[PDB]
């Protein structure tokens with residue numbers, strides 16, 4: 001398929017900055033969610049899940065179509081718990097009905113990251129809602145109970161290299177696993193609603209113990225009360241992965257830069273931007289605007 005970005009008719013930067021501010025103010029306000037973690041983390045997960053269905057082989061899936069809006073994709077077992085990010089954005093969509101779904105879903109991710117003190121993520125508008133028949137079949141999102149080979153192989157479908165895989169996974173610093181959703185339980189660290197390189201430090205510095213949880217799945221448990229999925233853990237089992245983990249554990253800046261690039265790339269996979277298309281926008285945070 002060819003997916004050409006098409007700017008929402010007559011909208012500019014300022015229009016988008018308003019959508020951004022709307023999400024950000026709601027993030028600030030609905031702070032009681034998930035025991036006071038807030039919605040930030042679920043939004044980031046939602047932006048990754050709508051983008052992660054992409055197949056570099058036939059150009060299907062990815063964020064373009066806003067297909068998560070369809071039952072098929074919405075009811076993907078792997079998307080369990082995302083309905084919360086969805087209901088968070090609805091009221092927003094209602095307020096700015098001209099924005100396409102794909103644009104909204106992906107912007108929430110950017111907004112969440114930036115408002116949780118992460119790096120600035122350049123964003124591009126132009127995703128166009130596609131018909132329900134362009135909805136990708138379930139089973140394109142990765143399993144958690146695998147090793148580094150699985151991960152490398154998987155990520156290759158999305159065109160991501162080692163560096164990109166490790167950068168993107170540092171997103172695990174945010175939120176936590178929910179038994180009910182995924183069959184895994186516990187956060188990855190302490191500051192789970194602030195974007196930092198905590199993930200890498202926990203990985204390197206905790207004394208991880210393999211145990212089975214109440215869903216009868218194996219997870220790495222630390223005495224600090226943290227957990228790591230087998231897929232997380234595999235970042236230290238693979239030699240190529242481990243040196244990158246180390247780099248990030250050592251330099252939060254480097255990690256921020258790598259994440260930034262990788263995240264935008266993830267969100268733009270499968271989209272063709274005509275040369276006349278506007279440059280990537282860099283939204284200001286509420287704080288930068290004095291709001």
Ligand code: HEM
Pocket residue numbers: 041042044045048081142143144145151168169171172174175176177178179180181182183184229231
């Ligand atoms: C091997 C690849 C990955 C696997 C197997 C994986 C698996 C999971 C699982 C099982 C959960 C818990 C869901 C729940 O029970 O609520 C989760 C949560 C999360 N995922 Fe990952 N993930 C992967 C990659 C990513 C990437 C690339 C990102 C973004 C860059 C990401 C962002 C998140 C966030 C922010 C959460 C926490 C959400 C919350 O607190 O509701 N994950 N992931």
